[PDB]
Subunit: 501 residues, 4 copies
C-alpha cells in the first residue's frame, strides 16, 4: 500500500548526534555535530514516510538551521528518496522575558494581583512580568482594560483590570493557579497590535532560507492577503517564484480574511496551537473542517498540524484521543499531517513518524466510504474540470492501480490531486524544483524523467516508469492524463486507459 | 442543422420516369426506364435527408430490383453523397389469390357465411376464397376452429366456425362489412403455420441481393434466433460478413423471443403494419417503446416503420396525428424512421422525406429535456463504458460542437452513438463497406479518410476533416475518441478535448 | 382497471334519435328529439369512460344546446354516474360566406388569381369570396400585402398580392389545387385583427350556459389574461365562482402570453386544430409537450384535443398513428383527452370513446417507467408540498391501492393529482359543484359524502367509502390525506397509512 | 439550543462529601457520607447535561453502590430533571495480585526475565507475579507459548517464552521498560480463556442492581449472543424486561460476532480502553466508525466511551486531541458519549461534563453538512420506514423546531431517533420506565403525560406540552408522529405538520 497522505516532520536535536552523544546526555551541546551519524538517523525518518522537513526559525540561529539543511541533503542520499524543505517564520511572537537571579519559573494563585511591563530590554521579576515583543514594539496603547494575557499555551490567564500611564504597565489578576516560566509564549486575544506585514527579522530569516534552498515557507500569524504578498515579493525578487507559500491561520483576523488569504497563498497550515488560545477551544474542530474544505475547493494544499501525537514526546505509544485526532484529519481530507515536538525534541522521533504513517494508511482505507471531501460539488463547465471528473469516475468505476501524469509545471498533478482519486498518482516531471514542490500534494508520488518527443512516446514513458518503480505489473489498469503537447503551456486535455502489458 | 435521426426511404416507381412519363400517366408500364432523369429524382430525396434506400422484394422481380439499385448508384454520384442499401425479404407472406373473370374485389356484409380454400394454384370466387401461401404450404392442419383470418390490413375479419375434411376448406362468418380484393395480405393470429426457418425463394432473393451489393437485410416475420442465423450463414458463405441483419418483429413469437433475436441480429425494425394485426392494436405503442429501449441497451440500431406519414401517399400535408407519431419515435430514441408507401408509389415522395426530416430535427431539439433513453442505466465496470460515459458527460458539461472518431471496424462510432451525446458524431473510416454500414446509426456522419501513422496524426486528421467538411470553425470545441492504436484490434481507450485552431 | 386519464367527449346529433331515426337516415332533421332513447345512447358513452361532455357553441342555437344538456342530465340518472358539463365559446371565428345559386363548393388550381371581399352581409361567388367575420368586423385595414388566407383546416392557401382601396378587397393567388366550400373556417396567421376581449355573442352564449348549469368554460382564441378575466367577471357577477375556465391556446399571441394566461385560468385546452394552421405544422408536438409541463407545474388541468382519433368519424378502427398520438398524450402527462368530431357527428361515437379509454389505460401502465412529468422538479419549502411529496413517496415505496382524501374546496385532491401518484385518488366531498368540478383532474374519482365530526371519524369515513365503492378490500393499504380540520379553510397538513380491516 | 447527543457520566467519590471533606483531603474515607451535600453536587452534573449515571461494579461493594443510587434519586429531586441509571458489570477481569510487604509497584527493564503465577489466592513478588483471575479460574492450559501478557492499560508487555508444568507458571521476558503496580488490569490477546457466559459474581451484581432499580446494564467482555441472553434471562425472571442491555465490545471475539450481538442487545458500548489493548491500537478508529454505523442501522443505541477527556482528571482544560476525539464521535453519529474517571475520581467533575456538552452542541451544528450517518441507505418498503422518511424529509425541507411523539412503548421515538431528524424530538409517554429508558436515544427529550382519548386530543396534548416546556412558541412549526390509536400496540402510521398557535 502507498501512504497517500503527506507527512511534515519538524527537525531538531532529537535526531542530531554530537561526539557519539544523543539529546538528553549531559554536555551534549558542548560536543560538535557528527553530520554522517545524524543523516543516517534522518534517513530512517524519510524511510518511515516523512515527505517534508520543517525548519522552525523560532528556535536556532542561521548557522544551526543551515547546517541541519546540509545534513538532510546527505540524508536524502542515504535513503535515495528526495523530500521537500519547509521554512517556518517566527513572526510576531510575544514571549516572557528572562527572570532576575536565573529563577526558571514562579507559581501564582487565583485572586493574586501583579503587573505586566510593556518596556522592552528589561528582565522579569515575580512582582512584574517583562514581555519580549518581536521587533521591540510598545503594545501599551494596543491592549485595553478587560483584555486577557495568556502564558504557556493559554494554560494561565491574567485579566487586565487597570493600566498605569506613569510606568506604562498593566495591572492584572491571576484567573487560575499556574506557573509563569521564562521564554514561554504570550497571547492577547481580540487585539490588533500593529505588527508590520513584514518585520525585519522575518525578511532576514526568509532571505537566508531562500539562499540555502527551500521548497516552501509557512508564514506565521497571517492576518490578511497583504502579509502573504509581502513574502511573495521577496520570492520573485530573489528568482525563487517556485517557492510555495502556506498561510498559517493562527488567529481571528486570519479566519475573518480566510477567503482572500487562500486566493493569495499556495496552501494553508492549520496551526491548532496558537488558534486554540486565540479562539474558543471547543471550536477548533469546526474551523479545522471548514478550512480543509475551502482550501481543497481552491485546489491548494492543507496541512493539519500541532499536538497531533503530543504524548509521544515522552511515551512510546500515543493516547486513543491522539490516534482518533490524526485519523479524522485524513477523513476531513487533509493533504498533510505534521509532527512538531514529537520529531524535533522528543525521545521517540522515528516511532512518532511510524505511528503517524500507520494511522494515515488505515484512515485512507476508509476514505472511500467515509471521506468528508466531495469532488461532485465542484464546477464542471471547463475542459480541465470535465477531464479530472472523467479520471475520478474511471477510478470509481474500475480497479485503477495508478493515475500517471506527465507534467512540466505539475499543474495536471495538482488538478487530479484535488479530485482525490481512489488511486495512487505518479507525477512525472522534468525539473527537481517541480518534483520537490509536489511533495505535499495528497496521493502524488513525484518522479523525475526525460520530456516526451510525442503523445505516443508520452504513453510509453508513463507505463515504463510505473512498471520500473514496481507500482504496476502486467494486467494492472492505469490512467494517463496530460496537457498535450506536454512541452507547450496548455492545461489538461487528454486521458488514456491502458492495461499494463 | 444536422439531422441526427436517420431516414430509411422505400424506393419504387413514384420516382422512376418511363419515356418521359411519370407513374400514373397513360401506359407508363409499357415504356422503358429513363435512368438518368430517374436518378435526378432519387438524388433530390438524398439531398432532402434520405440516408438508406429499401428494396422491398415482396413486389418486383430481380431484373426490376437490380435496375433500381443501379439507378441509386448513379443517383449518389449526382448528389455527391453516399447512402446505405437495404434489402427487405418477402418471407412467409399469405395473399388472397386472383379472382375468376378479372374481378378486382367483392363486398360482403356481417353475418354472411362463406369458405376459404387451402388448395394451392386455384383462383378465387366471391363464394370461395383461395389463399396464395408462400412455397405452396397446406395450412388446413395448422389452423383451428375459432381462429380468425384477416384481409387488407386486418380491416375485414373472417371467423373459422367449421372445417370440411372432404374439401380441405374453412367455413367462415364475415364479422364486419368489408371488401376482399385480390393480392391483399392475409393474417392468422395465434397460429404456428410451420413455415421453414429459411424458404427457398428468400435464399435466392438474398443471394441475388448480395451479388448486386447491399449493406443491410431486413428479415420478415422473425420468430426465433434460428431464422436470423440461417441468413447469417449465407452472408458468411458468400464473403458478405459486413452485411448487417435487422430482425423484423412482425408477430407474437417474435415479441416472446425478442431477447434471443436481439443477441442474434445487428438491430431491429419495428414492423407496425403486420404487428398491429398480429397483436392487440392498442398495444403497438407499448411494444414500440419497450423494443427501442432493449435494442439501445444492446448497442444496436432500431428502425420504427409503417404508416409513419400514411396520408402523404394521397395528400401534400400529413395529419397532426402522423406528425405526433414520427415526433415521439425520435423521443423514444429510435435510430431511424422509415417511409414505405409514401416514397415508393405515392404522389409526394420528395415532400414525404422533407416533411419527415423537418419533424426529425424538431424532435431532436427536445431530446435533451424529454428523451426517454437514459445512458446512466448502463453498466460502467469496463473501459469502453467509462470512456463513452466521459464523452457523453463532456457534451453534457460544455458546448461540444462535434465528437470525432477514427474507427477501423466502426466500433467506437456505435459506442458513442449508443450513449446519444448532445453532439453530431463525425465517424472517420478507411473503407466504403464500414462507411455505408454506419449510415443507420443515430447521429453518426460517416466519412472516408486515410489511416493515421500515429496518435498525434490521428488528432491532426480528425480536426482537419471536421474543419474541411464545414462542421466546425476556429474557436469551436470538439471531442476526439478512439481505440489506440487505430490499426490494432483494440476497443475505445482514449479521449481528447481540442479547441479547434 | 381504473382509467386515471379523463375523457372529454363533444356531444351532437350522432347520439340523438329523431322519430326513431338515427342521424344520416332520410329527413332526420324534420323529426323531434326522442329524449329517452337518446339519453340511453349518452348513458353508454359515460359507461364506456366519458367523464365530461362538451357543448360546442360554434354550431347550434340556445334551444338546441339547452335541450342537449337536459338529455345528459337524464343520461346520468340512467348510468347512475355523474359527469362534468363543459361549454366551448364560438369566439372570433372567420368563416366563408354562403354561395349564390346554392352552390356548395368550387375547385381552383395553382397560379389562379381571384379576390376576397371584406364587406359583411354579402354572398360568395366562385370569382369573389365573401368572409363571415364574427360581429361584422371590417378586416381590410388589419391585413397586410404578403399575408396568407387559409381555408378548410389550412388545406388551401391564398396569398394577398394586392389590396383595392376602391372595392375594399384583397387580390389573392391560389397556392395549391383545392376546394373553397361554404361555411368553412378561415385563418390569417401573423395578424392582430382587433376583435374585442369579449364579443357580445360570447357574453350571451356564456350567460345562457351559466343559466342552464355548467362546470367548465373553454374560451376560444385566448390572446391574453384580459380575455380570460372578462369571462371571470361574468362568473363572479352571476354567482358562478365555481365555474373553472380553460384558456384554449389557438394562436401565436396565446403561445407568447401562455405564462400570464396560465396564472389567469383554472387550466388549458391544447387546441391542435387552429394551432396547426396558426403555427408551423411540425412545431405542434413541441408546444403540446411544453404546455402540458407548465400547466402541471401550476397545479392546473390540461386537455389535449382535436384529431386525436380523426379517422373513426368514418371507419370502425383508428390508424396506428392516431393510437400512437393518444398514447403519447398520456405519457406527456395530459390530465384529459378530447374527442370532437368522433362523438358529435361520426358513425362510431361509442367505439371512439371505447377505443380512447382502452389506449388511455394502456398508456397509464407505462406512466411509471416512461412518464415525462417529474414531481421531484417541484419546490419543497412549504407544508402542502412536503405533504404531497410524502404521499407520492408512500405510493412509490409500497403497494398503495388507493389515496383517499376528504376535501371541502377540493384543494387536497388537486394537490395529490398534481404529483401523479402511482395510485387511484378517491376525493370525498360535501357538495355537487365541488364533485363535478374535480371530474377533469387526472386520477381523481369524486364521490359525495357527509362532513366528518372529528379526525378519527374522517379516517373511518375514508376507509368505509373506499370499501363500499369496491375500490379496496380487506388487507389492502390506503393513504388518507387532508387539511385538518376539514371544515376550517386550511391547506393539507395530515397523512395516515391504513391497512384496510 | 438543546444538546441532542446524550452523556453518560460515571459516578464516584469526586462528587461525594464526607464530614464536609472532599476527595483527596486525608482521612476522608473515615468520615460518613453527607447525602444532602453530594446530591447538591450531583444535581450540578445533571444541570451540566449528564443524562445517565454509570455505577461501575468493578470498584465498590453493594453497600457503596446502593447508597450512591439513593443519592442520585435525591439529586433528581433537587435539579427536578430525571436521568437513567446504568449498571456496568465487572465481568471476566484479570488483575495483578497484592505485593508482599505492602510494596505498591516494581520497575523492570527490557530483556529482564520473570515468571507469572497461575495459582490463585497467593500474593505477588518482584520475582513472581500472581494474577487475580475472576472466579478463581486456572488459565495455565488456556494461554500458549509466544502469547503476550499486558499490564496497566497494555503499557507494559511480557512475552511468554516458556511454561513450567512443575509450578504451573509462565516464564516471561520484559518487552519494554515499565512499572507493574498492584490491582492493575491484565490483558492476554488472541486467547479464549473459558470464562462462563455468566459468572456467579456478575449474576449477584445484576440481581442487586435490578433490586435497587436500574434502566440499563452494560455487559463487559461480550464474546457472543449467548453472553447477552444469559443476562436477558435474569431480567425476564425478576420482572425487569424493560431493562435495556448494552453489549460492551471489548475484544476480537466481540468484533467477529458483532452482527449476532447487535441482534441480541438493545445497543452497544464502544469500550475503547479494553479494545485498544486487545486489537491493533491504530485500528480503534476504524472499529468505532463501523460499529456506530451498524448499530444505527439496527435502530439501536451506541455509546462511544473511555478516555474521551482523559487529561481533565488532573487539569481544568482538555487537550486539542481530546476535543477533536469527542467532536468526531458526534460526527460519526454516536447516540451518546461517556466520561469515566473524569467524573468519578478526577479534580474537575463538573467542568468535564460542561466541556463534553459544549463540544457535543458544537459538533451537532456540523451534523447537517458533515454527519457520517445517512438515513437514505435504509430500506423503504414498510409503513414505519416511509413514515419516518417523511418526518426526516419534513425537517430537511422546512424549519421544523420540534418533532413530537406520543408513545406507549417509546417505539415511535426510537424510529424517528434512528433517522436523525434536523430537529429536537419530544417523546411523550405514560410510564416512568419508558421515560427513563429513552434517555440514551439521540435527540429524544422524554416527558411524562396523560394518555390521549382521541387522535384530535393527541394533537392538542402534543402542542400544549411542547409550548408549556418552552420548546416552541407561536409561528413555530412542529411535526406530530404516532401509531394511532396510541393506546393499541400498533407501529407508526400517522404524521401531522402544525403551525403552533
Ligand atoms: Mg503558532
Ligand atoms: Mg410485414
Ligand atoms: Mg378552434
Ligand atoms: Mg473494559
Amino acid at each position: 500500500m502507498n501512504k497517500r497522505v503527506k507527512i511534515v516532520a519538524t527537525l531538531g536535536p532529537a535526531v542530531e548526534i554530537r561526539g557519539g552523544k544523543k539529546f538528553g546526555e549531559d554536555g551534549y551541546w558542548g560536543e560538535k555535530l557528527d553530520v554522517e551519524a545524524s543523516a543516517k538517523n534522518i534517513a530512517k525518518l524519510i524511510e518511515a514516510g516523512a515527505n517534508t522537513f520543517r525548519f522552525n526559525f523560532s528556535h536556532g540561529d542561521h548557522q544551526e538551521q543551515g547546517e541541519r539543511m546540509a545534513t538532510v541533503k546527505l540524508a536524502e542520499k542515504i535513503a535515495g528518496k528526495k523530500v521537500g524543505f519547509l521554512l517556518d517564520t517566527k513572526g510576531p511572537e510575544i514571549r516572557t522575558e528572562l527572570f532576575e537571579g536565573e529563577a526558571k519559573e514562579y507559581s501564582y494563585k487565583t485572586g493574586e494581583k501583579i503587573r505586566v511591563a510593556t518596556k522592552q530590554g528589561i528582565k522579569s521579576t515575580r512582582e512584574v512580568i517583562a514581555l519580549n515583543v518581536a521587533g521591540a514594539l510598545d503594545i501599551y496603547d494596543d491592549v485595553e482594560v478587560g483584555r486577557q494575557v495568556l502564558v504557556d499555551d493559554g494554560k494561565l490567564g491574567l485579566r487586565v483590570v487597570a493600566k498605569d500611564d506613569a510606568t506604562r504597565e498593566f495591572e492584572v489578576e491571576v484567573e487560575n493557579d499556574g506557573i509563569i516560566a521564562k521564554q514561554k509564549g504570550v497571547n492577547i486575544p481580540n487585539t490588533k497590535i500593529p505588527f508590520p506585514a513584514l518585520a525585519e527579522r522575518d525578511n532576514d530569516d526568509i532571505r537566508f532560507g531562500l539562499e540555502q534552498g527551500i521548497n516552501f515557507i509557512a508564514i506565521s500569524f497571517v492576518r490578511t492577503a497583504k502579509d502573504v504578498n509581502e513574502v511573495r515579493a521577496i520570492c520573485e525578487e530573489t528568482g525563487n517564484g517556485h517557492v510555495q507559500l502556506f498561510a498559517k491561520i493562527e488567529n481571528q483576523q486570519g479566519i475573518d480574511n480566510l477567503d482572500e488569504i487562500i486566493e493569495a497563498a499556495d496552501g494553508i497550515m492549520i496551526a491548532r496551537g496558537d488558534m486554540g488560545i486565540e479562539v474558543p477551544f471547543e471550536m477548533v474542530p469546526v474551523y479545522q473542517k471548514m478550512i480543509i474544505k475551502k482550501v481543497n475547493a481552491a485546489g491548494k494544499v492543507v496541512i493539519t498540524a500541532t499536538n497531533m501525537l503530543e504524548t509521544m514526546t515522552e511515551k512510546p505509544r500515543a493516547t486513543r484521543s491522539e490516534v482518533s485526532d490524526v485519523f479524522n484529519a485524513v477523513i476531513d481530507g487533509t493533504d498533510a499531517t505534521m509532527l512538531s515536538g514529537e520529531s524535533a525534541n522528543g525521545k521517540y522521533p522515528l516511532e512518532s513518524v511510524t505511528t503517524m504513517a500507520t494511522i494515515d494508511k488505515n484512515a485512507q482505507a476508509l476514505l472511500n466510504e467515509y471521506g468528508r471531501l466531495d469532488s461532485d460539488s465542484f464546477e464542471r463547465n471547463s475542459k480541465t474540470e470535465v477531464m479530472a471528473s472523467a479520471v475520478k469516475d474511471a477510478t470509481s468505476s474500475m480497479d485503477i492501480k495508478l493515475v500517471v501524469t506527465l507534467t512540466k509545471t505539475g499543474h495536471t498533478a495538482r488538478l487530479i490531486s484535488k479530485y482525490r482519486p481512489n488511486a495512487d498518482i505518479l507525477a512525472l516531471t522534468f525539473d527537481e524544483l517541480t518534483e520537490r514542490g509536489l511533495m505535499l500534494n495528497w496521493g502524488v508520488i513525484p518522479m523525475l524523467t526525460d520530456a516526451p518527443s510525442s503523445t505516443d512516446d508520452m504513453f510509453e514513458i508513463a507505463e515504463r516508469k510505473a512498471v520500473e518503480a514496481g507500482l504496476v505489473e502486467s494486467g494492472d489498469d492505469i490512467v494517463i492524463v496530460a496537457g498535450v503537447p506536454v512541452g507547450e503551456a496548455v492545461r489538461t486535455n487528454t486521458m488514456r486507459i491502458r492495461t499494463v502489458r
